[PDB]
Amino acid sequence: MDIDPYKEFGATVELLSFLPSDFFPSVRDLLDTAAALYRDALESPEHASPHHTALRQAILAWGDLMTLATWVGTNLEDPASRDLVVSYVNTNMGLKFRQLLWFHISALTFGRETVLEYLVSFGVWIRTPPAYRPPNAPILST
């Protein structure tokens, strides 16, 4: 079966390819902003929203990957094939957990309809020719 992480939220993996893969801030910055003012709500015993739910399942699925990145560093004796794994997890796999972490946190902050309009408005700027492309990128705010 072909599940899309963003389908139920009115988005799609298509629409998020609009954003360049070198947008989405670091996983550090994301998780930090999560525990900023959602720390309480995330540890709450009640699913505040479908957004909150996915954010929890994403944060933990990432946590499983940091437990993997540690066990690999302390059980793989060959450091040529040990640092080939601890790189892929913190780089390539981290990208999917950056899009997901951005999307859900941005929604809890600004609103899912505001986010979906941002994804579209960005796809006008990013696809606007460099000559007329305005100096400032569109940024989510209030």
Ranges within 79-118 binding ligand 58H (CB under 6 A): 102, 105-106, 109
Helices 50-73, 27-37: axis angle to 10 degrees equals 130
Number of residues near ligand 58H (by CB under 6 A): 20
Q: Which does 27 bind (CB under 5 to 8 A by kind): ligand 58H, a copy of itself, none?
A: none
78-137: which residues touch a copy of itself (CB under 8 A)? 78, 80-82, 84-85, 88-89, 93, 96, 106, 109, 117-118, 120-129, 131-137
CA distances 55 to 19, 64, 68, 86, 138, Å, are 20, 14, 20, 24, 24
Give the nearest distance from C-beta 21 to a copy of itself in angstroms.
Answer: 10
Nearer Cβ to ligand 58H (48/85): 48
The residue range among 27-35, 67-75, 77-85, 88-96 that interacts with ligand 58H, by the rule CB under 6 A, is 27-35
Could you give the CA distance from residue 79 to residue 132 in angstroms, rounded to a whole number? 49
Residue 87 CB, shortest distance to a copy of itself, in Å, is 10
| C-alpha closest to that of 11 among 54, 47, 60, 43 | 54
Write out the binding residues for ligand 58H, residues 30-59 only, by CB under 6 A: 30, 33
C-alpha–C-alpha distance, residues 50 and 134, integer Å: 35
Helix (H) or strand (E) holding 4: none
User: Residue 127 interacts with ligand 58H (CB under 6 A)?
Assistant: yes
